[PDB]
Scaffold this active site. Structure first.
Site, short mmCIF file in Angstrom:
data_model
loop_
_atom_site.label_atom_id
_atom_site.label_comp_id
_atom_site.label_asym_id
_atom_site.label_seq_id
_atom_site.Cartn_x
_atom_site.Cartn_y
_atom_site.Cartn_z
N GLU A 23 -2.07 4.07 13.38
CA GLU A 23 -1.67 5.36 12.84
C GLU A 23 -1.82 6.45 13.89
OE1 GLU A 23 -3.30 6.33 8.98
OE2 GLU A 23 -1.72 7.87 8.74
N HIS A 74 -9.24 3.28 -1.38
CA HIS A 74 -7.88 2.78 -1.25
C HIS A 74 -7.50 2.10 -2.57
CE1 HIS A 74 -4.38 1.03 0.38
NE2 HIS A 74 -4.86 0.40 1.43
N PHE A 111 0.87 -3.40 4.22
CA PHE A 111 1.10 -4.78 4.62
C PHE A 111 2.56 -5.18 4.41
CE2 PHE A 111 -3.04 -4.18 2.73
CZ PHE A 111 -3.85 -4.49 3.79
N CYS A 141 0.78 -1.23 0.00
CA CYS A 141 0.00 0.00 0.00
C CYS A 141 0.81 1.28 0.00
CB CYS A 141 -0.98 -0.03 1.17
SG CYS A 141 -1.89 -1.59 1.20
N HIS A 162 -2.72 7.97 6.35
CA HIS A 162 -2.98 6.76 5.59
C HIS A 162 -4.48 6.35 5.66
CE1 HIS A 162 -1.95 3.32 3.23
NE2 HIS A 162 -2.47 2.52 4.14
N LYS A 176 -8.87 8.77 1.96
CA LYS A 176 -9.46 7.48 1.65
C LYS A 176 -10.96 7.41 1.95
CE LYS A 176 -5.33 4.50 1.78
NZ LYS A 176 -4.55 5.75 2.06
C1 LIG Z 1 2.16 -1.10 8.74
C2 LIG Z 1 0.95 -1.22 8.25
C3 LIG Z 1 0.22 -2.45 7.86
C4 LIG Z 1 0.97 -3.74 7.98
C5 LIG Z 1 -1.08 -2.48 7.48
C6 LIG Z 1 -2.07 -1.35 7.26
C7 LIG Z 1 -2.26 -0.33 8.41
S1 LIG Z 1 -1.55 -0.42 5.72
C8 LIG Z 1 -3.02 -0.82 4.76
O1 LIG Z 1 -3.18 -0.42 3.62
C9 LIG Z 1 -3.91 -1.64 5.61
C10 LIG Z 1 -5.18 -2.17 5.15
C11 LIG Z 1 -6.07 -2.95 6.06
O2 LIG Z 1 -5.49 -2.06 3.96
C12 LIG Z 1 -3.46 -1.92 6.91
O3 LIG Z 1 -4.14 -2.65 7.88
K LIG Z 2 -1.78 9.76 3.36
#
Ligand SMILES: C=C/C(C)=C\[C@@]1(C)SC(=O)C(C(C)=O)=C1O
Ligand SMILES: [K+]
Ligand SMILES: C=C/C(C)=C\[C@@]1(C)SC(=O)C(C(C)=O)=C1O
Ligand SMILES: [K+]
Lengths: 415, 415
Positions: free
Chosen positions: B321, B344, B403, B170, B310, B339
């Site tokens: 976050e 997303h 992820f 992501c 994010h 978002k």
């Molecule tokens: C360090 C961050 C990680 C592993 C995951 C996140 C917050 S990023 C993302 O795009 C996302 C989802 C559910 O789409 C997350 O749950």
């Molecule tokens: K952002």
């Protein structure tokens, strides 16, 4: 003054451990002893899918020791092959580095691949045809991803200063190591685990590269197919591999009592903007990357003793590289094309060949380029052939170029 | 002294053009006007494959103007979708930057994706089942590759100072822009084209993320599904996008008479080493990346006015976050979760959100976070909601996590 390694503008970075699995050996020290005895990883392909698809290519090297021999039913359920190879190599690399406890927040992982978990997407697609969206693994995303292997190693080793995956077809493994280097000299990390992994010899990539006319078909003599720089070369030969190295600051290396194998002095990334798959014949941009690595190392072309060539064994491929090496001011160097013994491994190969460069510097020796029997009039390089060549190798550049016109040169020093 | 933008140790880098296609508009200026009017890109999914697979998720935003509307039978034969989107956005970005003639050897391209040309591998596999290895395109390698889009743009624009593809699920689109920044301040380039592209809403990723429990299923009200930071959020909503920006040195920008939109001051990449898909709850490493970007910008947390979060809208995602932003010393900032309106887009979204941050700085305005109706007791952030918020936004940080536990923070300044 522009910052450089040699002038103290960048910190001293050393390679302190190395690991690889190849078509000669699962042990790297054993791959090195085998190369110097002129063994070849390449043989006739036993795989029944050759006669199935009636393929023009009937040769290549599988790993001597299949990754999945070291994998149980758990590992098999949660990871793509490239992740599986990642775990294996990470595990081994740490073990060899005396299993040190580093600061997780000064610790990066950079690992490229050509493709990542592509087998897994047919798998998830077939499962969903059979029994619906609920038959698809939660897990699937993180097998599926091309950052999959880097993620696995970072997690397994506890790297908290970034886990990156550059992809640039054939040069991914060198690019990874360049960026790990960038990551360290920029203050972002003190230690980094870097390299490339790549999946096994499959039908589809054989078909795709065959259709390019990129692949040797000297099926009658498998070990004699891969002929980098030779008048009679007819393309590349596949050879499975994966390689990682541990790089850290000299300060850090000294601080934990770890003898360095070599120094990593600089790195140059440039691009052709010429053609989607073929290299620029003039070899100017590829040569430029060689220069950049020297600019950053703090070196002149006169210091380069050895060039570990990309040497894929294609007509245009090698001609281009030859031009690049002139352009860089490096044609007076001893050249090695390890792809003549180990074949080509897309995302991994740059990393494996960087390991080979380091060993060359440590051991003051270049293995013979195999199958070098007729110098190409058009090339005029000092290609090491026949037996190994012992010599005073102070600095060496490892070349790695890939489809898209991606150029990576790593400059390394003897410690 | 450690080198920084503010102290002159790094050269001044400015954003001088931006382009995006989203589920609101193919025009970015139009996406911005729409957001500020509180439009949502998210609607009921018309696609027959929803009732086919009886999917739990029945909502998402397709591009307002389908990429392939701008694609003829030629383009369709040689490129994956993500390459097609790349060509389109490259073409537009140049056009907007007044079509300048730059030095190819000071010019980089950095473009991430989550996946790259995955549709193409089923295609090549099905063609080979039907009619053999010879029915597989020579071309196939260079559609297939995950560096595919970056390669296409580099070739099309004539970028000769490197063409790179970072992948980190992501956060790929932000990571790309970080590395373009690194590439420029390190002397390697003067100008760079950077961002992220990503393919359309397909069945498989819906299934994979659904099985994670990561996805909203508020199907009864599609525009109200994506609720970042809201007490009632139930996961993320897909929203197609792709975004690139042109960044160059201020010297260079001044030299060709191009008014900058904003400055790119620094970038921080770190990693969780926590879990393969979930973020570290403590949000310490993600916060660390926010800090790194400030260290390199030459800023303190007190200078950050705006954080472009994010904000995926998952329970644990947003909680994490929130912790990160405290850790970074930034909770006193105005927060925006784009978002909530745009959904997303994995590899693209970081890039799109970086474009949004730049526009926020140029226009002194934050669009409302949509669907923010009940503050989460556990979050306590200053989330912009209701109408747009006009304000004195001097510096802003764009967060992007993915992820694998990958953290990218970009720090930007008002010009
Ligand atoms: C360090 C961050 C990680 C592993 C995951 C996140 C917050 S990023 C993302 O795009 C996302 C989802 C559910 O789409 C997350 O749950
Ligand atoms: K952002
Ligand atoms: C800039 C270099 C490009 C585009 C291609 C090369 C030389 S790299 C490689 O691995 C390869 C082959 C045939 O495999 C090439 O033909
Ligand atoms: K090489």
């Amino acid at each position: 003054s522009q910052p450089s390694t040699a002038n103290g503008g960048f910190p001293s970075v050393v390679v302190t451990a190395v690991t690889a699995t190849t078509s000669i050996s699962p042990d790297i020290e054993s791959t090195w002893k085998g190369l110097l005895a002129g063994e070849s990883g390449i043989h006739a392909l036993e795989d029944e899918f050759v006669t199935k698809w009636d393929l023009a290519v009937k040769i290549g090297g599988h790993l001597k020791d299949p990754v999945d021999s070291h994998m149980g039913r758990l590992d098999m359920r949660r990871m793509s092959y490239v992740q599986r190879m990642g775990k294996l190599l990470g595990g081994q690399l740490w073990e060899s580095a005396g299993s040190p406890e580093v600061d997780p927040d000064r610790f990066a992982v950079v690992v490229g691949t050509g493709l990542g978990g592509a087998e897994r997407i047919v798998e998830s697609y077939d499962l969903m045809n059979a029994g619906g969206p609920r038959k698809v693994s939660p897990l699937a995303v993180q097998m599926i991803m091309p950052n999959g292997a880097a993620a696995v190693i970072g997690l397994q080793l506890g790297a908290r200063a970034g886990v990156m995956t550059p992809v640039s077809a054939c040069s991914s493994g060198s690019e990874a190591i360049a960026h790990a280097w960038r990551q360290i000299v920029m203050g972002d990390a003190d230690v980094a685990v870097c390299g490339g992994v790549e999946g096994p010899i499959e039908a589809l990539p054989i078909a795709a590269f065959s259709m390019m006319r990129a692949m040797s078909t000297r099926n009658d003599e498998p070990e004699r197919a891969s002929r980098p720089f030779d008048k009679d070369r007819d393309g590349f030969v596949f050879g499975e591999a994966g390689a990682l190295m541990l790089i850290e600051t000299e300060e850090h290396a000294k601080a934990r009592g770890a003898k360095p194998l070599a120094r990593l002095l600089g790195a140059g990334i440039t691009s052709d903007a010429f053609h989607m798959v073929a290299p620029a014949a003039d070899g100017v941009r590829a040569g430029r990357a060689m220069t950049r690595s020297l600019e950053l190392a703090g070196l002149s072309p006169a210091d380069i003793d050895h060039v570990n060539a990309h040497g894929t064994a294609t007509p245009i491929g090698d001609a281009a590289e030859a031009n690049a090496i002139r352009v860089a001011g490096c044609d007076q160097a001893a050249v090695y094309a390890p792809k003549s013994a180990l074949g080509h491994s897309i995302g991994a190969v740059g990393a494996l060949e960087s390991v080979l460069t380091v060993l060359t510097l440590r051991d003051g020796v270049i293995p013979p380029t195999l199958n070098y029997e007729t110098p190409d009039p058009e090339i005029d390089l000092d290609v090491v052939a026949g037996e190994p060549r012992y010599g005073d190798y102070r600095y060496a550049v490892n070349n790695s170029f890939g489809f898209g016109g991606h150029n990576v040169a790593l400059a390394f020093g003897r410690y």
